[PDB]
Design an enzyme around this catalytic site. Sequence first.
Site, mmCIF file in Angstrom:
data_model
loop_
_atom_site.group_PDB
_atom_site.id
_atom_site.type_symbol
_atom_site.label_atom_id
_atom_site.label_comp_id
_atom_site.label_asym_id
_atom_site.label_seq_id
_atom_site.Cartn_x
_atom_site.Cartn_y
_atom_site.Cartn_z
ATOM 1 C CG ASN A 132 67.091 18.054 95.188
ATOM 2 O OD1 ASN A 132 65.979 18.204 94.661
ATOM 3 N ND2 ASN A 132 67.426 16.956 95.906
ATOM 4 C CD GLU A 178 68.815 22.844 96.825
ATOM 5 O OE1 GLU A 178 68.952 23.115 95.631
ATOM 6 O OE2 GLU A 178 67.694 22.414 97.190
ATOM 7 C CD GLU A 234 67.305 26.737 96.327
ATOM 8 O OE1 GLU A 234 67.530 27.457 97.328
ATOM 9 O OE2 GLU A 234 67.003 25.524 96.409
ATOM 10 N N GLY A 270 71.127 24.281 76.225
ATOM 11 C CA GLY A 270 71.429 25.598 76.750
ATOM 12 C C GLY A 270 72.437 25.603 77.842
ATOM 13 C CD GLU A 302 67.162 24.487 92.053
ATOM 14 O OE1 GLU A 302 67.565 24.080 93.173
ATOM 15 O OE2 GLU A 302 66.030 24.972 91.896
ATOM 16 C CD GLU A 317 65.998 17.576 99.153
ATOM 17 O OE1 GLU A 317 67.076 18.130 99.439
ATOM 18 O OE2 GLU A 317 65.718 16.401 99.413
ATOM 19 C CG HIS A 321 66.705 24.179 70.927
ATOM 20 N ND1 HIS A 321 68.031 23.805 71.027
ATOM 21 C CD2 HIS A 321 66.031 23.387 71.793
ATOM 22 C CE1 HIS A 321 68.152 22.851 71.933
ATOM 23 N NE2 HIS A 321 66.952 22.571 72.413
HETATM 24 C C1 0GJ Z 1 66.558 21.620 73.453
HETATM 25 C C2 0GJ Z 1 67.609 20.678 74.014
HETATM 26 O O1 0GJ Z 1 67.118 20.235 75.321
HETATM 27 C C3 0GJ Z 1 67.823 19.379 73.232
HETATM 28 C C4 0GJ Z 1 69.175 18.751 73.549
HETATM 29 C C5 0GJ Z 1 69.324 17.293 73.033
HETATM 30 C C6 0GJ Z 1 70.823 16.893 73.066
HETATM 31 N N1 0GJ Z 1 70.809 15.545 72.590
HETATM 32 C C7 0GJ Z 1 72.014 14.733 72.714
HETATM 33 N N2 0GJ Z 1 71.927 13.401 72.244
HETATM 34 N N3 0GJ Z 1 73.141 15.205 73.182
HETATM 35 N N4 0GJ Z 1 67.806 19.643 71.837
HETATM 36 C C8 0GJ Z 1 66.737 19.100 71.020
HETATM 37 O O2 0GJ Z 1 65.892 18.364 71.540
HETATM 38 C C9 0GJ Z 1 66.777 19.513 69.537
HETATM 39 N N5 0GJ Z 1 66.176 18.510 68.741
HETATM 40 C C10 0GJ Z 1 66.855 17.293 68.582
HETATM 41 O O3 0GJ Z 1 67.914 17.105 69.129
HETATM 42 C C11 0GJ Z 1 66.173 16.233 67.728
HETATM 43 N N6 0GJ Z 1 67.114 15.760 66.800
HETATM 44 C C12 0GJ Z 1 65.692 15.079 68.592
HETATM 45 C C13 0GJ Z 1 64.532 15.543 69.508
HETATM 46 C C14 0GJ Z 1 64.092 14.423 70.445
HETATM 47 O O4 0GJ Z 1 64.595 13.260 70.353
HETATM 48 O O5 0GJ Z 1 63.224 14.661 71.331
HETATM 49 CA CA CA Z 2 66.636 23.531 95.247
#
Ligand code: 0GJ
Ligand code: CA
Lengths: 235, 51
Positions: free
Chosen positions: A57, A62, A65, A186, A55, A60, A41
């Site tokens: 910070n 280091e 990187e 990711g 990486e 900044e 995604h």
């Molecule tokens: C793409 C990635 O950064 C996020 C990770 C969210 C992990 N969330 C938790 N509580 N561990 N994945 C997404 O944003 C995929 N979409 C969703 O999770 C949606 N259900 C909510 C999107 C939102 O609240 O912005």
């Molecule tokens: Ca840095």
Amino acid sequence: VVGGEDAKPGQFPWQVVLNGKVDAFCGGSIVNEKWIVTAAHCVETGVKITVVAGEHNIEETEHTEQKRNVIRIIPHHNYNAAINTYNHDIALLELDEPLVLNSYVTPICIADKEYTNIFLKFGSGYVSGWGRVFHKGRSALVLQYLRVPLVDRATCLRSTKFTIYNNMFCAGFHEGGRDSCQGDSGGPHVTEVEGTSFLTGIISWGEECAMKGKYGIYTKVSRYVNWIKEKTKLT
Amino acid sequence: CNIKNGRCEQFCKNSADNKVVCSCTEGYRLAENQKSCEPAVPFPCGRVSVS
Ligand SMILES: *C[C@@](*)(O)[C@H](CCCNC(N)=[NH2+])NC(=O)CNC(=O)[C@@H](N)CCC(=O)O
Ligand SMILES: [Ca+2]
């Protein structure tokens, strides 16, 4: 990462950050000198992306990187077979030039399907990233990490209206307050086995972040290790 | 391999005569004791070396 702690430099030397039309928009993990594993995604389009290894910070310098361009993106072939499910939320990124391995730039280990699952079921893994430190809040400057416990399937099933596939697992705390979040996708869920860390999940999705009664949902890496090994061969 | 992973530091496989064979991931070698895993490269996967 909500409710975590600052990493030390070199504590998670397999962690990378992804930058593009948004900076620090997702994480990844080093498979080897030419290959990163991340969430599909994060890389749906094929806009140009860069990877930064070593990486710590993100505001900044280091002098650890290593920045690379992505020259090939391979989302899992079943990702988006079914719209908006996050099933098979995993992708591989080939770098233009090899990373130079060192104490700050080191791959994560990847076991076979059997042992990856064995390690997951030990029931405690670490997540890390530069994502939001509060739900709908700001992102981290210093790499965050958090230990999260594995959550039983029945519990996780009841926590959400959304489907939890066999290709996913849930992790987090019954009381909430500590979770991965947007911007962390990711990045790795890792399990340390006698001082050696193995990849057991990919940070994938959730409902808000760190809400009580909700859990983080992760891609179950054991189901994809054969594919990761096949596509990332060096020759 | 049933108890404590057959004492293999990483991977165990059941062989014959109720014996066990240990193995290691890429970048490690099966050590002399035939249980532990020793690094075979300067920066083996999954280890913190910054200290
Ligand atoms: C793409 C990635 O950064 C996020 C990770 C969210 C992990 N969330 C938790 N509580 N561990 N994945 C997404 O944003 C995929 N979409 C969703 O999770 C949606 N259900 C909510 C999107 C939102 O609240 O912005
Ligand atoms: Ca840095």
